Ligand binder design. Structure first.
Ligand code: SF4
Lengths: 628, 290
């Protein structure tokens, strides 16, 4: 099987073979046939009476663990713990953002750059704004956001875009969210030996936990990031490994937390550091981003995107990365080993993510700019250790357009609003094109890479099929970066891949057929958008012809995302089977009974063409239900 | 019934009416009997633009229903909707041709029916010059004669060439609107199919001024969209046939504005209840400068 559809990826894999270094593909091959029990989710290790493995085939072999737990119980608890872990990752990201908001000041390193956005958020949090200092408002907003994480009395605060009907449905179902850390703790408590042994209740607890990610953690992280670093607008950038410069210092930012990458971008324009880069013999400083931190700095500043998850190692294989600065999440620990074969400084900066044999330079949030300058100076000084004979940068990079926040999308939609009719600054043109049938629907393509799928193949095939069927596509994360590398994030792509209705819409609004809405936490934006559409049409989000796809997901964060997208009322297709096939009841809940609960359900489909067909059929049947 | 289904239903009704009237013409006059429009050089302009074929006898008119049949594909995608609008336009043209071959004088005053080529050439000079900054196709009935007269005279005072289809003709007559080719208020006919008589004005504008040869349908549609500043104001309740004819106008690149609740399409299908702002809304939608 081919390892990737990306030519630059293939060239660097040949180079890695020539250099005698191992990749994620090599380790996947070394793992050989993976354990069937773990793959089906019928293995349990929740107590030291175990490990227990029960048969993935009902009626044969061992039926219960030592405590008496069935295959359905073991599967449901394993799934719930994946959701809890994903929720924890996203919530910790949002908590750091809220703490940064709490420390903003007029003369400090972290300021308020979008005051209108802050005032709207303050309105959503019942924070007074009129005749008040902007930083007093910011601190009050940060306090309310922080209380969302750990309040023990009262109800949490949810964005106004969330329909009232969806909230009432959640309350009736018993999944209405509480404080984020409280829900994570509840899931961890109920999976403990001898607690919850009922699959339906376990799945409902996991949905309840995932809601605190989708609508509170990721949402607050995104909106506070907009407040502090600016709301994204349409902006040009370049993507894929070709963005590395042979004659410049190459600094690659990998990870998820945006404050460090924002401070590194600011430090790169420091005159002393630019002079130092010139003095070490480089033309300048070339900042490139990877994964979600790359998505953030690219959405807000046009920083070039070096690559997505399964390309991170190959970035080092070029031999041109002088510094690789990582914060947390989706940072392959093998990088520490791999950087030994090159001059690269692999720099960890977060106390949450220590990696053995990496260079640890703790990013100081109290003095973010000075700390970022010190880290960047280490990367720049490493340019003297470059071995130019080992350098091979593929001449493969692609132009991309991104920055499509909900605000930017609304601004673009204002173009097709007749001034004599109005209203302006709404999602009404999008609702109109969806209701009329010019657009069949909207689909979110999100998720990681996975060695089980030819890298980027499923993302590209799913996106092309959807836009060919007049389904407008919004992309986040590594899927968005796969689209960027391929060339879908271009206005020209409208006439090259889209169907007639979507091509007309793209021409009228002057947008690409695929809209890059940011990082994984920025999936909250997608929720926001859908909610607005629903609130404009007076229906629940489960009545709309919308869907989400995770063609190549790998992370626990992806599991939590799919769970809260389904719980919000949006059908979700998974291109990688989750470890639930061992529990028939869990499969039936996720793919059949969920529709009775929240009006949406999971679809497991490993063939992208079949997934596109199923998405189109499901959207059409929801349209016929809605009468459009 | 959604927009696509409404357009498909309208196109099927137009096809049924065309089949009935063609059967009547075949029964009364014979398949060798001549089929023509008064003083034109492009036979039936819509069929000539779509295929390049000139319809000369009744048998060929009966064979032209296959064009309407092949232009109706009931799949909910935008291209099929535009093709279905074009099917309605072809069916309306066939109905008008059958009217002309059945009756010696199908239209009486003030209705003018078909517009001859010399009138098109006369209007071409003020069209490109800018003395005619647009073509207002008014179809249906306004709630009052006063509002219809007000809108029509507002268009007239701005130099636009306004064409009238339906009961709006009677409302304008009650409103003391002075009509004629020099007064730029042209009543086409009381039936919806009479709207084709302004559609052929645009089509022949591509045939005469644009120089596009017959059968180059995409070139004709591009020319009408980028050169002919026409728009539709549909007043009063809209049947499926009216919506299908509006889909044809959209296929020609002409935006359709109405006072009725319809599934809106930005820049193409717009609802404007306020009759005091309909003229400005149409001028903005068609990008017309006075
Ligand atoms: S919780 Fe039950 S099934 Fe799991 S390891 Fe312990 S005894 Fe075995």
């Amino acid at each position: 099987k081919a390892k990737s559809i990306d030519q630059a990826t293939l060239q660097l894999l040949d180079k890695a073979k020539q250099d005698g270094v191992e990749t994620v593909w090599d380790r996947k091959a070394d793992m050989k046939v993976q354990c069937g029990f773990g793959s089906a989710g019928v293995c349990c290790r929740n107590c030291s009476m175990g490990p227990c493995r029960v048969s993935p085939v009902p009626g044969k072999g061992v039926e219960r663990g030592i405590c008496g737990a069935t295959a359905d119980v073991i599967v449901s608890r394993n799934f719930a713990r994946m959701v809890a872990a994903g929720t924890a990752a996203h919530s910790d990201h949002g908590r750091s953002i809220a703490l940064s908001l709490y420390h903003t000041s007029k003369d400090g390193d972290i300021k308020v750059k979008d005051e209108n956005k802050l005032k709207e958020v303050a309105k959503s949090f019942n924070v007074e704004t009129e005749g008040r200092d902007i930083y007093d408002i910011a601190h009050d907003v940060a306090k309310e956001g922080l209380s969302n994480y750990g309040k023990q009395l009262g109800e949490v605060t949810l964005p106004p875009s969330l329909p009232e009907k969806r909230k009432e449905l959640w309350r009736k179902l018993g999944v209405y969210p509480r404080a984020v850390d409280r829900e994570i703790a509840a899931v961890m408590h109920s999976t403990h030996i001898g607690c919850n042994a009922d699959a339906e209740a376990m799945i409902k607890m996991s949905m309840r936990c995932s809601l605190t990610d989708g609508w509170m953690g990721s949402f607050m992280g995104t909106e506070f990031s907009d407040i502090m670093f600016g709301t994204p607008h349409s902006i040009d950038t370049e993507a894929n490994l070709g963005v590395l410069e042979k004659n410049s210092v190459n600094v690659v930012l990998h990870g998820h937390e945006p404050l460090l990458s924002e401070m590194v971008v600011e430090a790169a324009s420091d005159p002393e550091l630019v002079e130092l880069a010139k003095s070490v013999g480089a033309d300048g400083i070339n900042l490139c981003g990877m994964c979600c931190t790359g998505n953030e700095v690219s959405m807000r500043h046009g920083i070039k995107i070096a690559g997505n998850f399964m390309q991170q190692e190959l970035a080092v294989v070029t031999g041109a990365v002088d510094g690789l600065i990582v914060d947390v999440q989706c940072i392959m620990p093998a990088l520490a080993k791999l950087s030994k074969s090159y001059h690269t400084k692999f720099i960890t900066t977060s106390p949450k993510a220590h990696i053995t044999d990496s260079i640890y330079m703790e990013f100081d949030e109290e003095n973010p700019l000075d700390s970022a300058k010190k880290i960047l100076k280490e990367a720049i000084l490493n340019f003297k250790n470059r071995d130019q004979s080992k350098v091979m940068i593929p001449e493969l990079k692609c132009k991309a357009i991104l920055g499509y926040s909900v605000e930017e999308i609304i601004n673009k939609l204002d173009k097709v609003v007749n001034t004599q009719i109005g209203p302006m600054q709404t999602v009404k043109p999008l609702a109109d094109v969806l209701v009329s049938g010019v657009l069949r629907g909207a689909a979110a393509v999100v998720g990681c890479n996975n060695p089980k799928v030819v890298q980027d193949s499923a993302h590209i095939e799913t996106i092309k099929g959807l836009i060919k069927n007049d389904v407008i596509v919004v992309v986040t994360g590594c899927a968005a970066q796969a689209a960027a590398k391929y060339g879908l994030l271009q206005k020209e792509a409208a006439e090259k891949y889209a169907g007639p209705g979507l091509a007309t819409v793209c021409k009228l609004v002057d947008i690409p057929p695929v809209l890059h809405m940011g990082s994984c936490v920025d999936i909250s934006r997608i929720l926001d958008l859908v909610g607005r559409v629903a609130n404009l049409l007076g229906v629940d989000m489960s009545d709309l012809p919308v869907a989400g796809v995770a063609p190549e997901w790998m992370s626990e964060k992806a599991v939590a995302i799919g769970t809260y997208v389904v719980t919000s009322g949006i059908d979700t297709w998974l291109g990688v089977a989750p470890p639930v096939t061992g529990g028939p009841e869990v499969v039936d809940i996720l793919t059949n009974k969920m529709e009775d609960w929240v009006g949406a359900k999971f679809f497991i489909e490993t063939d992208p063409h079949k997934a596109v067909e199923q998405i189109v059929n499901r959207m059409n049947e929801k349209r016929k239900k809605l009468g459009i | 019934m959604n927009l696509f289904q409404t357009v498909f239903t309208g196109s099927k009704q137009a096809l049924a009416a065309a089949e009935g009237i063609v059967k009547q013409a075949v029964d009364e006059k014979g398949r060798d009997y001549k089929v023509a429009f008064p003083d034109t050089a492009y036979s039936l302009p819509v069929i000539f633009a779509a295929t390049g074929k000139k319809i000369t006898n009744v048998g060929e008119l009966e064979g032209a229903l296959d064009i309407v049949r092949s232009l109706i594909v009931e799949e909910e995608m935008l291209d099929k909707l535009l093709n279905s609008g074009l099917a309605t336009a072809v069916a309306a043209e066939i109905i008008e041709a059958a009217k002309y071959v059945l009756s010696d004088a199908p239209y009486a005053e003030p209705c003018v029916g078909f517009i001859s080529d010399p009138i098109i050439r006369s209007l071409g000079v003020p069209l490109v010059t800018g003395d005619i900054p647009g073509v207002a196709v008014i179809l249906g009935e306004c709630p009052d004669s006063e509002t219809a007269a007000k809108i029509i005279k507002d268009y007239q005072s701005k130099g636009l060439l306004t064409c009238l289809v339906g009961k709006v003709i009677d409302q304008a007559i009650e409103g003391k609107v002075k009509m004629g080719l020099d007064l730029r208020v042209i009543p086409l006919g009381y039936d919806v199919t009479s709207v084709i008589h302004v559609v052929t004005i645009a089509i022949r504008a591509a045939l005469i001024f644009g120089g596009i040869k017959g059968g180059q349908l995409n070139d004709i549609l591009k020319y009408t969209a980028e050169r002919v500043p026409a728009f539709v104001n549909a007043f009063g309740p809209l049947s499926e046939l009216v919506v299908s004819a509006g889909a044809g106008a959209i296929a020609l690149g002409f935006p359709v504005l109405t006072d009725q609740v319809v599934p809106e399409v930005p820049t193409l299908l717009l609802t404007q209840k306020d009759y005091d702002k309909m003229v400005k809304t149409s001028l903005e939608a068609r990008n017309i400068k006075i």
